Design a protein around this ligand. Structure first.
Ligand SMILES: *Cc1cc2c(cc1C)nc1c(=O)[nH]c(=O)nc-1n2C[C@H](O)[C@H](O)[C@H](O)COP(=O)(O)OP(=O)(O)OC[C@H]1O[C@@H](n2cnc3c(N)ncnc32)[C@H](O)[C@@H]1O
Ligand SMILES: Nc1nc2c(c(=O)[nH]1)N[C@@H](CNc1ccc(C(=O)N[C@@H](CCC(=O)O)C(=O)O)cc1)CN2
Length: 823
């Protein structure tokens, strides 16, 4: 049976594609067609070791893991197929004090999630895994009720479920070409016939890049090699009544599990030693590859084999049955690309899975929800397909994938920095000027200063779970901005120009704030139909009907995609241009900001003439700039929008003009300190698709009664009338040597009641500041709670925000006070 017309065509029949097909149809979508080149599981899926753990070091990916595991538990009763899901639990091993710290870090990040997770003692570990060498074990990170699954049986079960709900799965039926239509639908060609599809989804494993090239896209993926070793029966293992838990020996860099009555273990060897398929990127995947392995290579993993033999002694006497060497499809940062793709209509991807077996279930549900409802069910911008860009070259991808492979089990510190592939091409002249003067941070391809070196203080990367070498420098930079004037490179912003006949009306319906009048700027949010915060933008009305929109580097294409889809879906006639890479931006902030800049322009920068949030085009020392009086520091300041080629010159002229004022640099770490004191929310931390703007405390920017029927308007009215269950608040807390950064558990009377979203040290009050979600009944100023940082609870107090009033507020207070006193 062939369907010539489909609602959705899924390309690829690995666990990921089949999971998506199952979910879409289970949720009621008719005419789902999956096309598979040869047979189900023919890519990476069939050879996988099948490890499926509740553990993830991130945040919302925990939900993907959780959803997969709960699904895999249900599949047998649903389909009649046994999936071979072994659930003995999983233990990550710590042998160093720093790894014990990593576990404590991970615990505070996990106690506000449903994920059941514990730090356990050597005694408990030996009881669970009695064939373990306890020599050097200090602790374990334990998730009960997870383990490993048969990837073949799992896929078959999902296929059976899919067919039950009406999915047509066709194989062999390789997609050979894909052509878009003007109405946004698709023509799909296979040797078995063609399909007209309303949408297409790429889930083609290590052919994902070949599939994307069919529609003119270059997906940044590369197949890496990975090996596990399987042993024959081991008498001691056979003799066990209970199945052994899955282990990860982190110091040894391998995982290990029971396989029948023997053992299976997989190393992640070093960057220098690991192999990857650069030839497949250069020349394509070889035709006829399929259900196939690479030649085994025991030699390159020797160190980890020897490590395993000392850690689990019985491996010394065991024989090797098999060594499985097979391809895994990696993206640069190890995480998949999951979602709708910018720049092409109705094309979705689920590609680049480093851990597809654990992810397939949860991602299938997530992506099904997004397709069916028009918004992500929860925030997973860390998987966004369009976090990558033109800077993500094949060279970059190869180096970064090699790094992500080798770093599989290194200690994960906060404020982690990785250096492979850097710097990319995404830099101005300012990079060369500043690079030796500061610690450059990586953000969506850009190099952005985090903090600036001080003479006689350590300039090295020194990652830590506690305060480290940038602590004093950051305080210096805070003082610089508060007392004098600082310059910061803000060039990484996403930047879009919107004009054309319907520009105002498009923005008016996308955005929850009013649209600013010509010559003015405001802060405005793009909400989802359910009233979630998809984006926070700064909107500048530069000339009649022509706007500049500014967003964070991490949200550039995520936000552009949403805008472009709304425009075409709504029949709006506009011109949208992504000028992100055309422009640099310098922030000049602090009480001397006006004095310095006034020396360089005929434009009147006085308080009464150049008002807060005005935007004007002018010249700074003959360099054309668009200047907005605004600053995320909350001090007096202008953001100076200019051509990238002029960045180095503009910076030089400002720094020379500010010498008398003691002008100096500041970076993003100090910026975070400053914005937190002002209680400024950050998209991605305080709000995202998980939050409505009312619980986030963004109501000042929300105009529920503006005429335009903006997206999310009705949902938000309902939310407001019903009343909030939680609220974002600001906490202060004394600590000894560690500051909150967000994602930490908040406790009250022995129970977890919320979480921090961001944090800093406040140098002005000499204690820590954090934003946090807490129940509304526990959200009053003066309320006491506790924040869990590295295995210790610190008393915290809700404060009246902001800690420090902004410059415009202070200026208004003085102006009003003088007027009143003059009576
Ligand atoms: C190699 C490996 C991988 C692995 C592992 C151990 C080894 C040695 N252990 C794992 C583990 O313990 N836990 C885990 O979660 N993952 C583990 N993996 C990784 C796993 O194998 C992969 O992440 C996963 O299999 C990826 O699945 P996905 O569905 O994304 O991709 P696929 O299985 O490669 O399937 C792609 C399908 O697409 C078909 N195809 C290709 N081209 C076309 C066209 N043109 N038209 C239609 N279909 C197409 C392929 O035939 C394939 O079936
Ligand atoms: N250009 C500009 N655009 C941006 C950012 C920026 O850094 N500058 N940063 C991103 C972060 N969001 C905000 C949020 C608040 C403020 C801010 O400045 N708040 C004033 C708003 C003034 C008002 O409207 O009353 C306040 O007092 O709350 C600035 C950027 C988004 N776009």
């Amino acid at each position: 049976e062939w369907k010539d017309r489909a609602e959705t065509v899924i390309i690829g029949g690995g666990c990921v594609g089949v999971s998506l097909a199952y979910h879409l149809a289970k949720a009621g979508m008719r005419d789902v067609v999956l096309l598979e080149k040869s047979e189900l599981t023919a890519g990476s899926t069939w050879h996988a070791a099948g490890l499926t753990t509740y553990f993830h070091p991130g945040i919302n990916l925990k939900k993907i893991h959780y959803d997969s595991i709960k699904l895999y538990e249900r599949l047998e009763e649903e389909t009649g197929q046994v999936v071979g899901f072994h659930q003995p639990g999983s233990i990550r091993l710590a042998t160093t004090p720093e790894r014990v710290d990593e576990f404590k870090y991970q615990m505070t990040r996990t106690n506000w999630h449903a994920t059941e997770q514990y730090i356990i003692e050597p005694e408990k570990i030996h009881e669970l895994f009695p064939l373990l060498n306890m020599d050097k074990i200090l602790a374990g990170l334990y998730n009960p009720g997870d383990g490993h699954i048969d990837p073949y049986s799992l896929t078959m079960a999902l296929a059976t479920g899919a067919r039950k709900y009406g999915v047509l799965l066709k194989y062999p039926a390789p997609v050979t070409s894909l052509k878009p239509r003007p109405d946004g639908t698709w023509d799909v060609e296979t040797p078995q016939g063609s399909v007209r599809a309303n949408r297409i989804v790429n889930a083609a494993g290590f052919w994902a890049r070949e599939v994307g090239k069919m529609i003119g896209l270059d997906h940044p993926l590369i197949p890496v090699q990975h090996q596990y070793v399987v042993t024959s029966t081991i008498p001691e293992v056979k003799a066990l009544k209970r199945e052994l838990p899955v282990l990860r020996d982190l110091e040894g860099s391998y995982y290990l599990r029971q396989e029948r009555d023997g053992l299976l273990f997989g190393p992640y060897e070093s960057q220098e030693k690991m192999k990857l398929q650069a030839s497949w990127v250069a020349h394509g995947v070889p035709p006829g590859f399929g259900k196939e392995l690479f030649e085994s290579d025991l030699d390159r993993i020797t160190e980890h084999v020897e490590a395993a033999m000392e850690m689990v002694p019985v491996l010394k006497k065991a024989d090797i049955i098999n060594i499985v060497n097979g391809p895994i499809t990696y993206s640069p940062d190890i995480l998949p690309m999951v979602g709708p793709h910018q720049g092409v209509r109705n094309y979705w991807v689920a590609i680049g899975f480093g851990y597809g077996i654990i992810h397939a279930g949860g991602v299938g549900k997530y992506l099904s929800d997004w397709i069916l409802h028009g918004e992500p069910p929860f925030d997973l911008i860390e998987l966004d397909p369009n976090r990558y860009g033109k800077w993500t070259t094949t060279q970059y991808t190869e180096a970064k994938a090699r790094e992500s492979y080798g770093f599989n089990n290194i200690v994960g510190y906060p404020k982690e920095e990785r250096f492979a592939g850097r710097p990319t091409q995404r830099v101005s002249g300012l990079y060369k000027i500043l690079e030796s003067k500061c610690s450059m941070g990586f953000h969506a391809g850009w190099e952005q200063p985090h903090w600036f070196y001080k003479p006689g203080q350590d300039t090295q990367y020194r990652p830590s779970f506690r305060r480290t070498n940038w602590f004093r420098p950051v305080g210096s930079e805070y003082k610089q901005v508060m007392q004098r004037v600082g310059v910061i490179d803000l060039s990484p912003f996403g930047k879009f120009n919107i004009k054309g006949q319907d520009s105002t009306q498009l923005l008016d319906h996308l955005c929850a704030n009013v649209i600013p009048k010509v010559g003015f700027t405001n802060i405005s949010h793009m909400l989802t139909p359910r009233g979630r915060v998809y984006a926070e933008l700064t909107v500048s009305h530069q000339s009649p009907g022509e706007f500049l929109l500014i967003t964070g580097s991490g949200s550039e294409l995520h936000d552009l995609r949403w805008i472009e889809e709304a425009a075409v879906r709504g029949g709006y006639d506009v011109e949208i241009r992504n000028i992100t890479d055309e422009l640099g931006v310098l922030g000049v902030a602090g009480p001397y900001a006006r004095r310095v800049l006034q020396k360089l322009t005929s434009e009147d920068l006085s308080d009464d003439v150049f008002k807060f949030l005005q935007t004007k085009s002018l010249k700074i020392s003959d360099i054309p700039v668009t200047a907005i009086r605004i600053s995320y520091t909350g001090e007096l300041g202008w953001e100076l929008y200019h051509r990238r080629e002029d960045s180095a010159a503009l910076y030089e002229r400002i720094m020379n003009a500010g010498q008398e004022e003691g002008i100096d640099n500041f970076g993003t770490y100090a910026l975070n300190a400053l914005r937190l004191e002002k209680a400024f929310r950050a998209w991605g931390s305080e709000m995202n698709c998980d939050t409505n703007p009312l619980e986030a405390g963004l109501d000042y920017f929300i105009k529920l009664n503006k005429p335009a029927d903006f997206t999310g308007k009705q949902a938000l009215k309902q939310i407001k009338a019903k009343g909030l269950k939680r609220r974002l608040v600001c906490l202060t807390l004394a600590t000894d040597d560690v500051d909150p950064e967000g994602n930490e558990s908040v406790w009250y009377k022995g129970k977890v009641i919320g979480n921090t979203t961001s944090g800093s040290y406040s140098y002005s009050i000499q204690k820590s500041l954090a934003f946090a979600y807490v129940p509304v009944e526990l959200s009053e100023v003066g309320q006491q709670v506790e924040v869990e940082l590295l295995g210790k609870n610190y008393p915290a107090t809700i404060i009246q925000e902001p800690l420090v009033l902004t410059e415009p507020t202070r200026t208004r207070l003085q102006k009003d006070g003088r007027k009143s006193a003059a009576l």
